[PDB]
Amino acid sequence: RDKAPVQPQQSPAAAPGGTDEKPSGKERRDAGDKDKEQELSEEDKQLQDELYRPALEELRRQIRSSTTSMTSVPKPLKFLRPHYNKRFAADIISVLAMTMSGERECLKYRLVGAGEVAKEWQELDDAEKVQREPLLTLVKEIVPLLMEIEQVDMLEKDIDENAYAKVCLYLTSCVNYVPEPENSALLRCALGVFRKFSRFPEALRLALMLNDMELVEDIFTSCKDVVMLGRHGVFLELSEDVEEYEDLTEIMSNVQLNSNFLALARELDIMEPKVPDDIYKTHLENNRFGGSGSQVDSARMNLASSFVNGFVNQDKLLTDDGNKWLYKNKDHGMLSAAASLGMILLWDVDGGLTQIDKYLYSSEDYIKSGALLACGIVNSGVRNECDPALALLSDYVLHNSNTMRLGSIFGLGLAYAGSNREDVLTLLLPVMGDSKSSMEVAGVTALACGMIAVGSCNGDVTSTILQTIMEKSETELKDTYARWLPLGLGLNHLGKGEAIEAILAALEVVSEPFRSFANTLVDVCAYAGSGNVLKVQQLLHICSEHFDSKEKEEDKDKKEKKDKDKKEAPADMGAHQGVAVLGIALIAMGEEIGAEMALRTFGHLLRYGEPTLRRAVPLALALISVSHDADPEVSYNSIFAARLAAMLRQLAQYHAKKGTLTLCPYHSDRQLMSQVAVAGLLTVLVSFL
Amino acid sequence: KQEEERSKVDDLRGTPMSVGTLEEIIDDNHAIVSTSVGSEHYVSILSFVDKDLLEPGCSVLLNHKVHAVIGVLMDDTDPLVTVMKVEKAPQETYADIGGLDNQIQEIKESVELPLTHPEYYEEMGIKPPKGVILYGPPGTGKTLLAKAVANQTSATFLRVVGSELIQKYLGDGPKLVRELFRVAEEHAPSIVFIDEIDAIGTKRYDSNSGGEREIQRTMLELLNQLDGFDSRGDVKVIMATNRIETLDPALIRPGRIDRKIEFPLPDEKTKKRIFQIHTSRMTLADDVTLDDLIMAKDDLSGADIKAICTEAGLMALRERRMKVTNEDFKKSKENVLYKKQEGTPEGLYL
Ligand SMILES: Nc1ncnc2c1ncn2[C@@H]1O[C@H](COP(=O)(O)OP(=O)(O)OP(O)(O)=S)[C@@H](O)[C@H]1O
Secondary structure (H helix, E strand, C coil): CCCCCCHHHHCCCCHHHHHHHHHHHHHHHHCCCCCCCCCHHHHHHHHCCCCCHHHHHHHHHHHHHHHCCCCCCCHHHHCCCCCCCCHHHHHHHHHHHHHHHHHHHHHHHHHCCCCHHHHHHHHHHHHHHHHCCCCHHHHHHHCCCHHHHHHHHHCCCCCHHHHHHHHHHHHHHHHHCCCHHHHHHHHHHHHHHHHHCCCCHHHHHHHHHHCCCHHHHHHHHHHHHCCCHHHHHHHHHHHCCCCHHHHHHHHHHHCCCCCHHHHHECCECCCCCHHHHHHHHCCCCCHHHHCCCCCCCCCCHHHHHHHHHHCCCCCCCCCCCCCCCCCCCCHHHHHHHHCHHHHCCCCCHHHHHHHHCCCCCCCCHHHHHHHHHHHHHHCCCCCCCHHHHHCCCCCCCCCHHHHHHHHHHHHHHHHCCCCCCCHHHHHHHHHHCCCCCCHHHHHHHHHHHHHHHCCCCCCCCCHHHHHHHHHHHHCCCCCCHHHHHHHHHHHHHCCCCCCCHHHHHHHHHCCCHHHHHHHHHHHHHCCCCCCCCHHHHHHHHHCCCCCCCHHHHHHHCHHHHCCCCCCCCCCCCCCCCCCHHHHHHHHHHCCCCCCHHHHHHHHHHHCCCCHHHHCCHHHHHHHCCCCCCCHHHHHHHHHHCCHHHHHHHHHHHHHHCCCHHHCHHHHHHHHCCCCHHHHCCHHHCCCCC | CHHHHHHHHHHHCCCCEEEECCCCCCCCCCEECCCCCCCCCEECECCCCCHHHCCCCCCEEEECCCCCECEECCCCCCCCHHHHECCCCCCCCCCCCCCCCCHHHHHHHHHHHHHHCCCCHHHHCCCCCCEEEECCCCCCCHHHHHHHHHHCCCCEEEEEEHHHHCCCCCCHHHHHHHHHHHHHHCCCCEEEEEECCCCCCCCCCCCCCCHHHCHHHHHHHHHHHHCCCCCCCCCEEEEECCCCCCCCHHHHCCCCCCEEECCCCCCHHHHHHHHHHHCCCCCCCCCCCCHHHHHHCCCCCHHHHHHHHHHHHHHHHHCCCCCCCHHHHHHHHHHHCCCCCCCCCCCCCC
């Protein structure tokens, strides 16, 4: 109707006209009024007036909430103590209490730091449990633990909307936009409601982000309570890091309850179903052995081809293909070929000893040292290959068993990940105290103790890596030491959630840009990735640093950091000119499934002239795809047809055919512009089943 | 610093700079430059730019006064590459099966199956079809089936119109052939499509040089490039026309184009489906019988059916009627065909 009868009712100040007009306005409050509430300029004078004055607070929050305010709007509701499935309930509850209580939670969440906003917050939580459309109420009620009692208060009936919808969008947006400390509340209260619930790989991805040891005991009494079985042994062992299968095999070495979790969840039963079934359902032919194994000769390309043939795995045929192929081979390639029988067969525990045993203790140092390297390759649960190598290791400067130290300290780094294995590190004290002029002694020292030490409890600054810091800064020689020791330093820094070890090594370490490059290595490895863009604008500024190798690793951190929100991962690094930066993006594509935009970047990155960068393209190019596939390969044949390029092409052919185990060895590969002695360890980036 | 070396390279240049088309390597870095009009001194090259980006005979940056080679040409964004390089795999593989079904199978097991599985020639020692002329009456589906294979694909599709190669400059069209087959070479295994090359033979222009001596040279560059040398391998190219009279048989011969594929204007058994589907997305008074329209036009294309099934709705919605009267179909078909003369003759078989 017209506002002529109802409009001058705001003019009197008598109590009965208010106490019946406000219930009369409550009936018309289903649409608020006729219109956009142009009573405001006349009824804002009624502020100073004071029986049913909380109903006057309802009118006042109704009209101030009706037009616009950020702090004075929820003040009549916090003064009101709301009192006295509907359209009106959707109005004053849904949009008005959602937006109004939302700005009260934001304004007091940023302002003060009461219980009133907790009571209103639980009331709105209950009202949106009535409304039952989550998603927006949830993401609003994150920013007020509050979210803990919100989840256990909310979770009674609906499982997959809160679990799938809430835990999907808030897990992804929590690692994406939100900082870290509330993600622990996600993980613990999600451990509560998922502890109530079935389909346990939600809790196993909670074990992925948590890395908790109680969780695997609860999910093994519960996932033994739910008797597939060896398959969750498989992605259990794939999912788990270095620590919790050794803590798991020690507390389950105590209890075990059927001993089949000691069977599955240490080793050997992720791997017993696969390799026969790998032979069975797949049938791989011979003309890539012969054709791709025919790609000419030259003891390099041929040597690489042995590696390519070797990583073929239809039987361990290229293993037992005669003799005179390794006799053509030379020292560090003899390491690569002695380890290549390791690479053909990362299973066959009993067959590993009886195949490598001919090449064990042979006439050649590289055959025996790469042979124990192969013993470290083939398995990770044997630990009886240690002692024939372990006993020999000491040489005190540069004898044979230091190369067995390289293959056996590295291959034993492949072998075990304990709570903290300490006996092998007490063996590692005369290794770094030995300090051979061979790089990969301290190389596989840092990398191997890092593989022992990735997933440490927020890292540690213990005397192991503290000792290799002090003995690192002891000798400033052969800067590959100053690169690959901060490798294993940052590997021990992995396992962090909140580590101040960048500040600790910042105080101990920093100097002339060898150890400032150690500073940027700890800066890389301590910062795995979250919504933490301040180090990304730090990346923007110190990306322009005149020393152009802290540029290399510091800009190289990007594929670790933004690996999930990968749409921003295309950047203009190719549009820059510091050619190692084009190398950095060339790393940053990598190996996943590799969409058309990535191969489109390999359109330009495929065509470059420097042999380390033209060498650098087919590696990640054929890692990212594990004609179509062979079309860029024959395009590389069109590129060259140097020797490096030929080797790079061979590597690409090999490629053609946050788990830390796939995170380490390519950052171990990042110093490739060097000797084949370095490439003798190039075959230790064991990141594929 | 770098600034003085860059300034000295910039002052090796003389600010009125020019562009000329080359022929041949002169291996010891002194060169010789045709222009457009070709006045050719023994020129040099400004030796900090890369001479060996480029194969023999292509445009570079020149000078006007000593004619010397200065810089590499710009990768000149002609209006072709944006159309030639097909951006997205668009749409319309088959919204409606039942249009051809004869040479759908043929184009499948002749274009997809040799290409997408190149391992059957291993068993049986057969060469792939390089060029297939898909042709027939106008308005059949040739462009449609081209787009159908363009979306239903795993190869980088390319789409070329035959009048894209017709520009008035001298040697322009042969250069466009050169960059065209560079586009056809440097993507992937690729499916090139060429259309309207029966609109190139009895054709002369006014924005043009000497007519029979212009695109004889361009189509001869097409001859010497398409299925000449520069080894064929796996590059799919499809050319399409309506008529065959203006075709030089030097390209029709084997080696260059293997399979010859017509398209029949369809039978009434599929006219019922094509008329139905063209009328599938409108309102229509369903009492009317399309079987009159289906039986009537004896050599209908699908553009006929397109214009009929849309223009009858246009004549009805012309006066804002949702559903169509049969005499609006009369008006539609007698607009669409000039003198709808298929009755007697005959008419009187009967
Ligand atoms: N999914 C389909 N299956 C079969 N036929 C179809 C399909 N979609 C459309 N058509 C028909 O295919 C015809 C395609 O017309 P076009 O071949 O492009 O005509 P056109 O472009 O004049 O051919 P020219 O003269 O050689 S350029 C349409 O008129 C439709 O009737």
